């Protein structure tokens with residue numbers, strides 16, 4: 001049975017994902033930035049309203065993952081905060097200017113994260129030396145890695161993704177980027193244990209007066225369909 | 239005595255702004271989203287390192303200001319958080335579908351805000367009736383409003399801003415959108431009490447293996463404070 005993780009940009013979307021079969025949620029803010037740390041209000045809101053596992057992303061800004069000491073100070077505090085709020089895991093990633101995992105920094109994040117299941121995000125796809133990196137993530141105690149096989153979308157990086165899976169058992173490899181109902185079977189047939197999807201859609205602004213404004217939300221039906229595909233596939237596997 | 243407020247997307251940028259003359263900082267995250275609520279980590283960081291007044295923006299997402307019940311619940315908790323952390327003010331705004339200030343929900347925010355000085359942001363430039371909105375803001379107890387005179391840039395809307403300033407003594411009118419060292423004197427001559435500027439630029443990523451970051455320009459901040467100082471010192 002493959003694990004279905006849905007990226008949500010609001011508490012309502014995470015709830016919709018939960019009610020539609022999602023096994024886990026990656027909680028983010030700012031879709032146009034690729035996902036940034038949610039405000040404390042959103043975090044607390046989700047802890048009070050969402051029951052399935054929620055992993056908040058810890059990312060102060062978009063762009064690269066070579067944070068300054070100031071941004072890093074905030075990141076450590078956010079990690080401690082997410083742990084204290086009771087989340088079972090979190091998502092983050094830090095690299096040096098050459099694309100190598102910043103080990104000293106990641107170790108400090110792991111220490112602050114405590115028992116939390118940490119996901120090293122797509123910073124992995126911007127890094128050099130995939131295997132060497134996986135070995136080091138395993139050394140840090142990273143639970144899983146969100147990756148597209150270092151390609152524009154996970155389907156293109158499918159052969160690489162399979163390589164990662166066959167290289168080490170840990171961290172768990174989670175396919176992400178462009179993963180949708182139409183191509184889910186590719187990942188399942190390849191033996192991917194966890195898949196990440198935005199199950200995104202655009203809802204028009206209800207704004208009647210003006211002078212973009214569409215909201216990026218989770219399509220509940222899309223989530224259910226993907227979970228359906230996952231259940232049948234695991235079933236077809238006898 | 240014109241007040242210079244700088245929009246900063248990081249603690250370090252806020253510090254740079256402070257070291258260069260900024261009288262106040264609007265703290266935001268997500269420059270590409272037009273500015274969203276900063277995380278607790280960033281907020282705590284600024285409280286321990288920045289001394290001039292800082293007003294964090296409270297905005298869960300980009301786009302319109304007609305938030306869902308779920309988003310609004312988060313907004314109230316963030317107002318409560320910013321207040322509890324001791325910031326002297328905050329920036330936010332909620333509108334109904336017809337371009338009117340959402341009074342029932344804005345009232346709940348004011349209640350949660352307590353003594354904090356609340357700035358109604360550019361949601362104001364999306365309102366159908368500016369003078370009536372100013373009235374509504376004063377009714378709410380709003381301290382100041384960030385506006386471009388309802389134009390694409392504040393200079394273009396300057397004549398409108400001058401009209402707003404004389405209308406009433408409701409919230410303070412703070413000119414924003416396109417304000418920079420180059421055109422600052424226009425707003426000062428117009429009689430604007432407070433001005434807002436991001437005074438920044440997108441910085442290239444230092445990555446040597448394969449990419450931008452929005453940072454404040456401390457020189458620009460310093461130049462603007464100079465213009466302000468010289469203005470009422472001429």
Ligand SMILES: [Ca+2]
Pocket residue numbers: 128129130131132133
């Ligand atoms: Ca390698």
